[PDB]
Design an enzyme around this catalytic site. Structure first.
Site, PDB file in Angstrom:
ATOM      1  N   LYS A  45      -7.238 -30.294 -57.274  1.00  0.00           N
ATOM      2  CA  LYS A  45      -5.993 -29.873 -56.600  1.00  0.00           C
ATOM      3  C   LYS A  45      -6.262 -29.099 -55.288  1.00  0.00           C
ATOM      4  N   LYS A  85       0.813  -1.222   0.000  1.00  0.00           N
ATOM      5  CA  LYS A  85       0.000   0.000   0.000  1.00  0.00           C
ATOM      6  C   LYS A  85       0.851   1.278   0.000  1.00  0.00           C
ATOM      7  N   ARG A 143     -12.905 -32.502 -48.291  1.00  0.00           N
ATOM      8  CA  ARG A 143     -13.359 -33.762 -48.844  1.00  0.00           C
ATOM      9  C   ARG A 143     -12.543 -34.878 -48.188  1.00  0.00           C
ATOM     10  NH1 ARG A 143     -15.724 -35.955 -54.206  1.00  0.00           N
ATOM     11  NH2 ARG A 143     -17.605 -34.624 -54.246  1.00  0.00           N
ATOM     12  N   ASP A 188     -15.524 -29.715 -35.083  1.00  0.00           N
ATOM     13  CA  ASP A 188     -15.632 -31.170 -35.033  1.00  0.00           C
ATOM     14  C   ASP A 188     -16.601 -31.563 -33.929  1.00  0.00           C
ATOM     15  OD1 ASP A 188     -15.167 -33.733 -35.999  1.00  0.00           O
ATOM     16  OD2 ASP A 188     -13.208 -33.945 -35.063  1.00  0.00           O
ATOM     17  N   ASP A 189     -17.027 -32.826 -33.931  1.00  0.00           N
ATOM     18  CA  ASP A 189     -18.065 -33.274 -33.002  1.00  0.00           C
ATOM     19  C   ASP A 189     -17.530 -33.400 -31.578  1.00  0.00           C
ATOM     20  OD1 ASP A 189     -16.660 -35.482 -34.057  1.00  0.00           O
ATOM     21  OD2 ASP A 189     -18.359 -36.865 -33.838  1.00  0.00           O
ATOM     22  N   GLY A 211      -6.678 -36.201 -30.236  1.00  0.00           N
ATOM     23  CA  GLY A 211      -6.328 -35.120 -31.149  1.00  0.00           C
ATOM     24  C   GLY A 211      -5.720 -35.571 -32.466  1.00  0.00           C
TER      25      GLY A 211
HETATM   26  O1  LIG Z   1     -16.340 -41.505 -28.440  1.00  0.00           O
HETATM   27  C1  LIG Z   1     -15.987 -41.122 -29.547  1.00  0.00           C
HETATM   28  C2  LIG Z   1     -14.639 -41.103 -29.870  1.00  0.00           C
HETATM   29  C3  LIG Z   1     -14.234 -40.671 -31.130  1.00  0.00           C
HETATM   30  N1  LIG Z   1     -15.172 -40.248 -32.085  1.00  0.00           N
HETATM   31  C4  LIG Z   1     -14.652 -39.779 -33.409  1.00  0.00           C
HETATM   32  O2  LIG Z   1     -13.243 -39.510 -33.220  1.00  0.00           O
HETATM   33  C5  LIG Z   1     -12.899 -38.323 -33.983  1.00  0.00           C
HETATM   34  C6  LIG Z   1     -11.997 -37.391 -33.215  1.00  0.00           C
HETATM   35  O3  LIG Z   1     -10.763 -37.989 -32.863  1.00  0.00           O
HETATM   36  P1  LIG Z   1      -9.624 -37.040 -32.256  1.00  0.00           P
HETATM   37  O4  LIG Z   1      -9.823 -35.594 -32.519  1.00  0.00           O
HETATM   38  O5  LIG Z   1      -9.559 -37.304 -30.679  1.00  0.00           O
HETATM   39  O6  LIG Z   1      -8.250 -37.616 -32.835  1.00  0.00           O
HETATM   40  C7  LIG Z   1     -14.134 -37.440 -33.987  1.00  0.00           C
HETATM   41  O7  LIG Z   1     -14.269 -36.771 -35.252  1.00  0.00           O
HETATM   42  C8  LIG Z   1     -15.288 -38.415 -33.761  1.00  0.00           C
HETATM   43  O8  LIG Z   1     -16.094 -38.527 -34.942  1.00  0.00           O
HETATM   44  C9  LIG Z   1     -16.553 -40.276 -31.739  1.00  0.00           C
HETATM   45  O9  LIG Z   1     -17.440 -39.925 -32.515  1.00  0.00           O
HETATM   46  N2  LIG Z   1     -16.945 -40.713 -30.472  1.00  0.00           N
END
Ligand SMILES: O=c1ccn([C@@H]2O[C@H](COP(=O)(O)O)[C@@H](O)[C@H]2O)c(=O)[nH]1
Ligand SMILES: O=c1ccn([C@@H]2O[C@H](COP(=O)(O)O)[C@@H](O)[C@H]2O)c(=O)[nH]1
Ligand SMILES: O=c1ccn([C@@H]2O[C@H](COP(=O)(O)O)[C@@H](O)[C@H]2O)c(=O)[nH]1
Ligand SMILES: O=c1ccn([C@@H]2O[C@H](COP(=O)(O)O)[C@@H](O)[C@H]2O)c(=O)[nH]1
Ligand SMILES: O=c1ccn([C@@H]2O[C@H](COP(=O)(O)O)[C@@H](O)[C@H]2O)c(=O)[nH]1
Ligand SMILES: O=c1ccn([C@@H]2O[C@H](COP(=O)(O)O)[C@@H](O)[C@H]2O)c(=O)[nH]1
Ligand SMILES: [Cl-]
Ligand SMILES: [Cl-]
Lengths: 447, 445, 447, 445
Positions: free
Chosen positions: A349, A85, A345, A366-367, A372
């Protein structure tokens, strides 16, 4: 070099708890002991450490050598705020500044606004170090002077205004706002919506752990160092106490709701259980298949809505959804936001559909992420064609150390929800059995 | 056990010089030596010593033991002001107050007002020690926050009010007011007529010594600690520069006679006006003196009181008596400045105020000519009060002193009419013709 | 004509409590009964009354005739705020406006911000009536929409800004801020520091009676209608409940400290007891002699300091202290403020000392007031010489109906403290005996 | 017992006209008579009636009994929307919800979103009743607050999100979206693909009927209540003006064939481009159609989906199947607009999505020429799914329909290449030379 706020924002992504180091011990040696032990116990969950000079200066000459040792006994990643302070005429203040930054190697200091800004420049001129000016203090007799009206507003407000305007030349200034007064805390945030707040008073002094947070947190859900000193030093298990506070704070900030998302995943039959084998040979008891989302457009709109909350914090041009699973999700998101979609895809090219320029900023959608390995194939295919990957955003982080892998790879990452977060909700909702929960919990300890 | 002010008031009988100890030294050992040398040379003329912690704290561990050594090198009787600017929560503040008063053995400490009274209580509870609260600081950036308006008065003026009021529970609260701003010094002195000021700014910061004292000093001529630190540490001969300051300060305090600003104010205030007045004596006069209208100029009214107090300083009395109406507000102004109880007789142009029989009073009036003073001066003596002296601002030099002495009453004036002539020639308050006529008017007596 | 805020500010000098009239009864006739009884009980302490349309509209056709009777059953001095929460397209809103102001004769209405300002002008165009726009509502699901970020601030804040700026064309707009959320309340006051707040939630909903007040009160210590509805209708003794709230509110607002002043009067031997006879033949058990203040310059500086708090609210040129007692006090005040003094020579071509112009504004300073007989002699001697008397300010109001006498005489008046206020303090401080207190208390019942 | 939407969907088979009852009458008795007259004349062509409480509330006591009378004068089967704009705390809101649903017997109510979900719950808990939340209002001052940005979307767009999401627990939540703003109508429709809108603004406020419908209507061609109040009350002959509106609205809903905006978008979006392309057929072509890049223009992608939905409306199916990659995002867009589950086969240029054997699907592709459609159209039929039809946006008019019919597969296109010619001549999307070359290119088949 690295600034205080560089170090702090890093820990702020994890925690906001500031550990007060206020010795109070038999001798100067005893004082060091207590603190060393208090550091080792709390450091995982600590955002900052705060030695208050008074208790060290108590021990005279031996107390000064004591303060300096304790400061270096802090792992190189937790910023040290010296509660001293200070505040004197520029020339005298200089000596205090060198003592705190060059001699003691503290990263920040507390100071009094009273003597004007020219008394604070000696401290603020250090671009790497921070200064927290006293605004509204936690003590009951703070209102004695601070709550005086300077026409239209209180004195501390006049301080707050100056702290964000005329004084914040290089973004160094923080404010000390007390937790025992939530109403004053809220007013300072209205006057300084951007600044960081050092907030003491929790434990020995008063409380309002929630009321404080609802008052002074920024839009980012960050900007408050909640400091507890005596409360942790008198505690029985400091490590547990520290964790409890860190979590209690983190549970109030942020996610957001996550409860309706949990249901959606179950109502979509996305969560499935068994002995599944992933792209790793190692078997998981749980598999989340977000490909089913395609059969529920309403849930898909909800899912897309969650992604938007995350994606509202990044600056980008296009969205890159990764087929198959992510492409419908990415389409849905694209619709909510009105941002162009792009997709690689699925092959070896361009091999990239959509419309991209050169060096426009994309976010990979991604889902879910487990490890990774997939997220790398994509970043390499996309940076190939001349695109700047901003980040990767995901619905579910499976909690197999995916963040750290990708960070050390270079591109950063963020997930809407973690697997660990979804578990308690599903059990509550009766969607998951007791054995299913503990199986999954056990599986995640490996990582 | 022996209070900071007990010590000070005793030194203040000869000096108001505070020797500052802010050593800029290569090592902590040189700092102690530098300070030791400075103490030995100056102590005969030092009212107090003031080490600033910053410079001792610079050297860390050895530095603190250096601060303790420098303090214990001060001769007993000379008090030590620790300039540390403390202030935190009460629980923390205790550790700061112990450290200063019990470990370091300082006699007073400087402190910030920002955290309110409960933050200052841990210091102020030590009755034998003193606390100097920061009021209007020497730095130019003082204007940046202290000069904000809190209703009708400045922020520092509000700090002054609390310091001399709610906070001075144990009678041990002073104020840090810088020498660089004499306007501020007057204004704080106005709010705190009895408090000691710690006054930094002479020398390195180039404050005015004369301007500071005139604005800043108490009624008793001795309520300011003039601090000099670098001005003495840089000096080739500290002992001689301490002597030169100690004397200069004293000659200003103990200077007898009215000021140029008083003489000027009167004309501006229109208390003394020029016209073609004809008196009850039948002979005409070029000047008239009316201090009735003094009530519209409160700042002048302060000056007037300070000037009355200069005289009243050399008397022994319990109370002051003001004569209504002209001299009632004047007496009240003095009564404020000196902090002495007042008294007034009613039905003038019973006695209110508490008084006991045999109390020693000084009667205050506005003016004395020749006739009406001796009448009411006795409605008091009748109540068993002892008239020590009749004191007046302006003497018209018409043999009042002589006439009143014949009646066995002691008398004194702040300024005489003749004395005003050169005093307002020194500020052009009066023209040479205007001087000639007044001078010639007096020649008739 | 007279506006809503004219009527309200009048009652705000006394109370801030707003009585919610929310029937809930067997029939429409029963509904009227309950309310009529609730009006008669509370009206002394009520700042406002608030019938909420819903409970009246419940009863259909008979319910509408019921609302109108209850509205007229309110004494002509307590403003009636219709809680109807209207808001539609201008042309439709017009009909609602005429129904509330011309048909029902309500003085104010609640309304929704949602449809913009052009939906609110039909109500705001009435200069005599008030409109309280919904800002932050008391219900728990208020944050669902109101706490959305419109960049930098919340939605209700955006509302608040507009309510004080673009919408407050003729000073009609108030805001509805809920008591259950003190933090949101404080933020709205920071966005609308000038406006009046209708504040419900105390009793049935939540509380924070103090926390609310510390948050949303203006600099004047006014601008919050605290509304309790169900809490008073379910109460056993409504009159006592109403008084209790009115007092509990008034004790938090304002005086200010008064505790140190009480001591000063006793340490100065100003308060004396006996069988004194005043300038009226009627005897008082207590006499306060502020002429003794002259022997205590330090207390006199305190006394002058108290007067300043009052005198900071008036615009004036000079001070007129009335000899003898008041002249030293007036001198002291003059010194604190730096305002020219003036005084009437105590007698019968001026008889006034000092320096005055013609038509400059003065404030008469006197020691205490019992009745006002003296205060008239002075106002007549001063308006004689060509001076505009702003007000009269006094240390102690003896509580013998001095305010009302002077008001009906024309010039208004204010006192630092009342005799009734000093009594409890002196007893606590042991300065006054139990018999002395009850004697004085008994003496003041006559008036 | 019979839901507001149950009633509506049934009336919506013939009309989307909502007759508003806002009587401007001398007395409350005239109001009932005015409304009675208006109900008798219009009911055959009215989907709903909407009395606005304000105008009944104008007449106080008699006025309320007038509202109750007007409601009970509505023939059973025609639902009644009470436009009262309710919203307060839950405890108060109950009294408002009872009053509307149980006393007045209204079938739905309008309400403000401002007080959050818990304020709307007392209305929404009545499963048989409906709630229209205010979204983007007809007045110009809507832009003043509803058009503030909440991150990336407007405030009303956020209201849309909650209405169709968290709030529609009982499936009975609609939205008030004004006809005066068709941009808004599209944007709300984008956020709420399934919700009913209550649409005011036609007539007195001068909304566009065609623009509103095109932007605002659902996939099924029937998710808008077009409200007209003064436009009918002022009319000399209500029955004929109701008929004229009811027809006009219908001709727009049931209009078959692609829009000018679709045709134009395609060229701008560059899905149809002109060049000197040479095909696998060896012969050259002046035009190429690529809907792969549709993913960059989400608003166009919405249009495309709405246009697909127009066709799909006349089929009976359980799911839609999209063919990767070009038609996967297209299918997803449709799947959103219609609210029907989708399906896709992998490895294109297993089947994801839930499907049961014997499910009836419609296959969605981007384009049809002549050859590659028939191959993947069978990897689905193999899984036991029933291909109802193959639906495509653009037919190149190269005997696809004929060729596919020969293989026993049902086929349909949204627009043919020939049909595009006049559609984008109507907006100058194409030049006359550009028309000539396309026209001449087609002449070869
Ligand atoms: O329980 C799981 C484990 C993996 N993935 C698929 O694994 C891919 C990701 O892998 P990563 O980013 O860990 O290498 C994702 O695109 C997903 O579609 C699933 O859908 N459910
Ligand atoms: O306004 C402030 C500024 C700083 N501190 C410091 O924070 C710590 C309070 O923590 P605790 O011991 O009360 O839990 C103490 O070191 C105190 O000096 C406050 O309490 N209030
Ligand atoms: O308002 C203040 C308070 C304290 N000091 C102190 O005065 C000492 C310096 O005096 P000098 O160098 O001007 O002689 C320094 O320690 C400085 O902190 C000031 O100058 N102004
Ligand atoms: O934001 C608001 C606005 C208005 N009211 C009204 O104020 C009264 C609440 O008082 P009580 O019955 O909860 O004590 C009710 O009539 C309610 O409709 C609120 O509670 N909250
Ligand atoms: O207890 C009392 C009652 C009356 N007065 C004198 O009464 C005069 C005011 O009377 P009025 O204003 O009530 O007529 C005041 O100036 C005051 O000096 C007192 O001093 N103490
Ligand atoms: O956003 C809205 C909501 C409701 N109304 C209602 O529409 C009815 C008037 O329709 P009209 O006069 O334009 O035909 C009025 O009751 C008005 O309240 C609107 O125009 N816009
Ligand atoms: Cl996949
Ligand atoms: Cl008197």
């Amino acid at each position: 070099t690295m600034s205080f706020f560089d170090l702090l924002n890093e820990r702020a992504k994890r925690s906001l708890l500031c550990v007060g180091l206020d010795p109070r011990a038999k001798t100067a040696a005893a004082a060091v002991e207590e603190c060393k032990r208090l550091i080792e116990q709390t450091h995982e969950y600590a955002a900052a450490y705060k030695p208050n000079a008074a208790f060290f200066e108590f021990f005279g000459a031996e107390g000064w050598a004591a303060l300096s040792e304790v400061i270096r006994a802090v792992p190189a990643g937790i910023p040290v705020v010296l509660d001293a302070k200070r505040g004197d005429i520029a020339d005298t203040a200089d000596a205090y500044a060198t003592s705190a930054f060059k001699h003691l190697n503290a990263h920040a200091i507390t100071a009094s606004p009273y003597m004007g800004s020219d008394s604070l420049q000696p401290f603020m001129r250090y671009p790497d170090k921070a200064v927290f000016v006293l605004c509204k203090t936690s003590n009951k007799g703070s209102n004695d002077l601070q709550c005086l009206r300077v026409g239209d507003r209180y004195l501390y407000e006049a301080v707050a205004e100056r702290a964000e305007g005329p004084w914040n030349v290089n973004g160094n200034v923080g404010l000390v706002v007390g937790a025992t007064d939530p109403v004053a805390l809220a007013r300072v945030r209205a006057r300084a919506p951007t600044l960081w707040f050092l907030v003491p008073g929790i434990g020995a002094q008063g409380g309002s752990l929630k009321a404080s947070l609802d008052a002074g947190l920024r839009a980012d859900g960050s900007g408050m160092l909640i400091n507890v000193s005596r409360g942790l030093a008198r505690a029985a298990d400091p490590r547990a106490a520290a964790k409890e506070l860190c979590e209690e704070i983190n549970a109030i900030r942020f996610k957001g709701a996550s409860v309706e998302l949990a249901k959606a995943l179950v109502d979509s039959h996305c969560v499935r259980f068994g002995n599944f084998t992933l792209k790793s040979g190692k078997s998981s008891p749980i598999y989340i298949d977000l490909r089913r989302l395609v059969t529920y457009p309403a849930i898909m709109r909800l899912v897309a809505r969650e992604y938007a909350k995350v994606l509202r914090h990044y600056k980008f041009d296009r969205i890159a959804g990764l087929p198959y699973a992510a492409l419908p999700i990415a389409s849905a998101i694209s619709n909510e936001m009105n941002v162009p979609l792009i997709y690689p895809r699925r092959e070896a090219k361009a091999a990239i559909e959509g419309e991209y320029k050169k060096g426009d900023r994309v976010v990979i959608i991604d889902d879910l992420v487990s490890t990774g390995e997939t997220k790398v194939e994509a970043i390499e295919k996309l940076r190939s064609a001349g695109l700047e990957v901003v980040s990767i955003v995901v619905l579910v982080d499976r909690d197999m150390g995916a963040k750290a892998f990708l960070n050390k790879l270079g591109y950063d990452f963020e997930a809407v929800v973690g697997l660990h977060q979804l578990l308690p909700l599903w059990r509550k909702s009766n969607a998951i059995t007791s054995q299913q929960e503990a199986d999954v919990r056990a599986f995640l300890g490996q990582w």
